[PDB]
Amino acid sequence: TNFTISVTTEILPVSMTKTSVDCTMYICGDSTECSNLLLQYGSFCTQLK
Amino acid sequence: TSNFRVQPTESIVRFPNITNLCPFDEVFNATRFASVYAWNRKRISNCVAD
Ligand SMILES: *[C@@H]1O[C@H](CO)[C@@H](O[C@@H]2O[C@H](CO)[C@@H](O)[C@H](O)[C@H]2NC(C)=O)[C@H](O)[C@H]1NC(C)=O
Numbered sequence: 001t002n003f004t005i006s007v008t009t010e011i012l013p014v015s016m017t018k019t020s021v022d023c024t025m026y027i028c029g030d031s032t033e034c035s036n037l038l039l040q041y042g043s044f045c046t047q048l049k
Numbered sequence: 050t051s052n053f054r055v056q057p058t059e060s061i062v063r064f065p066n067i068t069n070l071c072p073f074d075e076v077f078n079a080t081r082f083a084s085v086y087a088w089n090r091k092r093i094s095n096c097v098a099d
Protein backbone atom coordinates (compact mmCIF):
# COMPACT_ATOMS: atom_id res chain seq x y z
CA THR A 1 0.00 0.00 0.00
CA ASN A 2 2.93 2.38 0.57
CA PHE A 3 6.24 2.80 -1.23
CA THR A 4 9.64 4.13 -0.19
CA ILE A 5 12.14 5.62 -2.64
CA SER A 6 15.72 4.92 -1.56
CA VAL A 7 19.11 5.63 -3.13
CA THR A 8 22.04 3.19 -3.03
CA THR A 9 25.65 3.65 -4.13
CA GLU A 10 27.64 1.35 -6.40
CA ILE A 11 31.30 2.20 -7.01
CA LEU A 12 33.17 0.75 -9.99
CA PRO A 13 36.84 1.35 -10.85
CA VAL A 14 37.62 2.61 -14.35
CA SER A 15 41.39 2.95 -14.75
CA MET A 16 44.62 2.90 -12.76
CA THR A 17 47.58 5.22 -13.28
CA LYS A 18 49.30 4.62 -16.61
CA THR A 19 52.92 3.54 -16.28
CA SER A 20 55.94 3.82 -18.59
CA VAL A 21 59.21 2.27 -17.42
CA ASP A 22 62.68 3.21 -18.63
CA CYS A 23 64.05 -0.19 -19.59
CA THR A 24 67.83 0.10 -19.98
CA MET A 25 67.97 2.87 -17.37
CA TYR A 26 66.35 0.66 -14.72
CA ILE A 27 68.34 -2.47 -15.65
CA CYS A 28 71.68 -0.69 -15.14
CA GLY A 29 72.43 2.91 -16.04
CA ASP A 30 75.57 4.70 -17.26
CA SER A 31 77.64 1.72 -18.41
CA THR A 32 78.66 0.65 -21.91
CA GLU A 33 79.06 -2.92 -20.65
CA CYS A 34 75.34 -2.84 -19.81
CA SER A 35 74.63 -1.96 -23.44
CA ASN A 36 76.90 -4.71 -24.78
CA LEU A 37 75.34 -7.25 -22.39
CA LEU A 38 71.70 -6.20 -22.91
CA LEU A 39 71.74 -5.84 -26.71
CA GLN A 40 72.73 -9.53 -26.96
CA TYR A 41 69.61 -10.81 -25.14
CA GLY A 42 67.53 -10.24 -28.28
CA SER A 43 64.21 -8.60 -27.39
CA PHE A 44 63.39 -8.81 -23.70
CA CYS A 45 63.06 -5.00 -23.58
CA THR A 46 61.09 -3.90 -26.65
CA GLN A 47 58.48 -6.54 -25.79
CA LEU A 48 58.04 -5.08 -22.29
CA LYS A 49 57.85 -1.52 -23.64
CA THR B 50 61.07 6.14 -29.60
CA SER B 51 63.72 6.50 -26.86
CA ASN B 52 64.44 8.05 -23.47
CA PHE B 53 66.12 11.37 -22.70
CA ARG B 54 68.86 11.39 -20.06
CA VAL B 55 71.20 14.33 -19.48
CA GLN B 56 74.79 13.32 -18.74
CA PRO B 57 76.87 14.85 -15.92
CA THR B 58 79.45 17.38 -17.05
CA GLU B 59 82.26 16.66 -14.56
CA SER B 60 83.17 14.60 -11.50
CA ILE B 61 83.98 15.63 -7.94
CA VAL B 62 85.22 13.56 -5.01
CA ARG B 63 85.16 14.35 -1.28
CA PHE B 64 87.08 12.74 1.57
CA PRO B 65 87.80 13.62 5.23
CA ASN B 66 90.71 15.65 6.59
CA ILE B 67 94.14 14.04 6.77
CA THR B 68 94.50 14.03 10.56
CA ASN B 69 96.94 12.41 13.02
CA LEU B 70 99.63 13.81 10.72
CA CYS B 71 101.49 10.47 10.37
CA PRO B 72 105.07 10.71 11.70
CA PHE B 73 107.53 9.93 8.92
CA ASP B 74 110.12 12.64 9.64
CA GLU B 75 111.40 11.16 12.91
CA VAL B 76 112.15 7.83 11.20
CA PHE B 77 113.51 9.13 7.88
CA ASN B 78 115.42 12.04 9.50
CA ALA B 79 116.94 11.33 12.92
CA THR B 80 120.15 12.40 14.64
CA ARG B 81 121.03 8.85 15.74
CA PHE B 82 120.04 5.43 14.40
CA ALA B 83 120.29 1.89 15.74
CA SER B 84 122.74 -0.81 14.68
CA VAL B 85 122.28 -3.46 11.99
CA TYR B 86 122.12 -6.22 14.62
CA ALA B 87 119.96 -4.27 17.11
CA TRP B 88 117.55 -2.53 14.74
CA ASN B 89 114.58 -0.74 16.30
CA ARG B 90 111.12 -1.72 15.07
CA LYS B 91 108.85 1.30 14.53
CA ARG B 92 105.11 0.89 13.94
CA ILE B 93 102.87 3.63 12.51
CA SER B 94 99.13 3.16 13.02
CA ASN B 95 95.90 4.96 14.01
CA CYS B 96 96.61 7.51 11.28
CA VAL B 97 96.05 7.85 7.54
CA ALA B 98 99.45 7.71 5.86
CA ASP B 99 100.79 10.34 3.46
C1 LIG C 1 3.55 6.29 3.51
O1 LIG C 1 4.72 6.47 4.30
C2 LIG C 1 5.10 7.85 4.46
C3 LIG C 1 6.40 7.85 5.23
O2 LIG C 1 7.26 6.82 4.78
C4 LIG C 1 3.98 8.62 5.17
O3 LIG C 1 4.33 9.99 5.22
C5 LIG C 1 4.19 10.49 6.57
O4 LIG C 1 2.82 10.79 6.88
C6 LIG C 1 2.62 11.27 8.22
C7 LIG C 1 1.13 11.45 8.39
O5 LIG C 1 0.46 11.50 7.13
C8 LIG C 1 3.41 12.56 8.43
O6 LIG C 1 3.26 12.98 9.78
C9 LIG C 1 4.88 12.34 8.11
O7 LIG C 1 5.58 13.58 8.18
C10 LIG C 1 5.04 11.75 6.71
N1 LIG C 1 6.44 11.48 6.43
C11 LIG C 1 7.03 11.78 5.27
C12 LIG C 1 8.48 11.43 5.15
O8 LIG C 1 6.42 12.32 4.35
C13 LIG C 1 2.66 8.45 4.42
O9 LIG C 1 1.60 9.03 5.16
C14 LIG C 1 2.36 6.97 4.19
N2 LIG C 1 1.15 6.82 3.39
C15 LIG C 1 0.14 6.01 3.74
C16 LIG C 1 -1.03 5.98 2.80
O10 LIG C 1 0.17 5.34 4.76
Ligand SMILES: *[C@@H]1O[C@H](CO)[C@@H](O[C@@H]2O[C@H](CO)[C@@H](O)[C@H](O)[C@H]2NC(C)=O)[C@H](O)[C@H]1NC(C)=O
Nearest residue numbers: 062063064065066067068069070071096097099
Ligand atom coordinates in the same frame (compact mmCIF):
# COMPACT_ATOMS: atom_id res chain seq x y z
C1 LIG D 1 88.85 19.87 7.22
O1 LIG D 1 89.31 20.86 6.28
C2 LIG D 1 88.35 21.89 5.99
C3 LIG D 1 88.97 22.76 4.92
O2 LIG D 1 89.91 23.68 5.47
C4 LIG D 1 88.00 22.65 7.28
O3 LIG D 1 86.99 23.62 7.00
C5 LIG D 1 87.39 24.97 7.33
O4 LIG D 1 88.82 25.10 7.48
C6 LIG D 1 89.26 26.44 7.76
C7 LIG D 1 90.77 26.41 7.79
O5 LIG D 1 91.26 25.86 9.01
C8 LIG D 1 88.65 26.92 9.07
O6 LIG D 1 89.03 28.27 9.30
C9 LIG D 1 87.13 26.82 9.01
O7 LIG D 1 86.57 27.16 10.28
C10 LIG D 1 86.70 25.41 8.63
N1 LIG D 1 85.25 25.33 8.50
C11 LIG D 1 84.45 24.97 9.50
C12 LIG D 1 82.98 24.94 9.20
O8 LIG D 1 84.88 24.67 10.61
C13 LIG D 1 87.50 21.68 8.33
O9 LIG D 1 87.28 22.35 9.57
C14 LIG D 1 88.50 20.55 8.56
N2 LIG D 1 87.97 19.59 9.51
C15 LIG D 1 88.41 19.46 10.77
C16 LIG D 1 89.52 20.38 11.19
O10 LIG D 1 87.93 18.63 11.54
